Design a protein around this ligand. Sequence first.
Ligand SMILES: *CCC(=O)N1CCN(c2ncnc3c(F)c(-c4ccccc4F)c(Cl)cc23)CC1
Ligand SMILES: Nc1nc2c(ncn2[C@@H]2O[C@H](COP(=O)(O)OP(=O)(O)O)[C@@H](O)[C@H]2O)c(=O)[nH]1
Ligand SMILES: [Mg+2]
Length: 170
Amino acid sequence: GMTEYKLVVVGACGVGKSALTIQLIQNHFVDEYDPTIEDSYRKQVVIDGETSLLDILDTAGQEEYSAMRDQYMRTGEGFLLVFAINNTKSFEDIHHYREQIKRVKDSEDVPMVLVGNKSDLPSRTVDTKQAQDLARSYGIPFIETSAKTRQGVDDAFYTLVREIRKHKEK
Ligand SMILES: *CCC(=O)N1CCN(c2ncnc3c(F)c(-c4ccccc4F)c(Cl)cc23)CC1
Ligand SMILES: Nc1nc2c(ncn2[C@@H]2O[C@H](COP(=O)(O)OP(=O)(O)O)[C@@H](O)[C@H]2O)c(=O)[nH]1
Ligand SMILES: [Mg+2]
């Protein structure tokens, strides 16, 4: 079939994984999506002239969840590491998600983007510099998003696809 990219969205409960995914797919802001629904969503997109079918796993369950997730993690070509700028714990969790990804990818080199969500909120608790510096250490892009305003949403996913393309050239 057509060109596909397998994307997985991860990060702490409540960071906005679902809101980001729904903004990408449906172009609206959902503020009360069941925090427990884990499903895959698709979108036909054009990125730098390339038409592809994005397959996006919006994760929600505990660390050990299902065979279907294990399968999605294995096919996963790129990962959005999401935290919320007003939640220090979600940022502190980031290495945990990166560790688990590297584990499911047989330790291999994995396209990723660090995403600081909820950029619209006034009471920032996560230091922008700390996020930039962490992303730099990982060798990955850092993008600030708001699922509310849609700022950064396309950039986050499209950047991830571009990272996958680069990886595929090796
Ligand atoms: C509100 C519920 C929610 O959004 N949750 C976020 C994800 N859940 C979670 N908690 C801890 N550790 C997790 C993981 F390690 C992983 C995971 C597993 C394997 C590879 C990569 C990866 F990110 C996932 Cl998908 C979710 C985790 C808690 C609930
Ligand atoms: N202000 C603001 N709220 C957000 C944003 N993204 C998500 N939320 C809210 O944060 C809560 C959790 O979002 P959700 O997408 O369900 O998080 P998930 O558990 O990671 O899937 C919901 O009340 C959303 O409306 C954002 O960018 N800005
Ligand atoms: Mg969710």
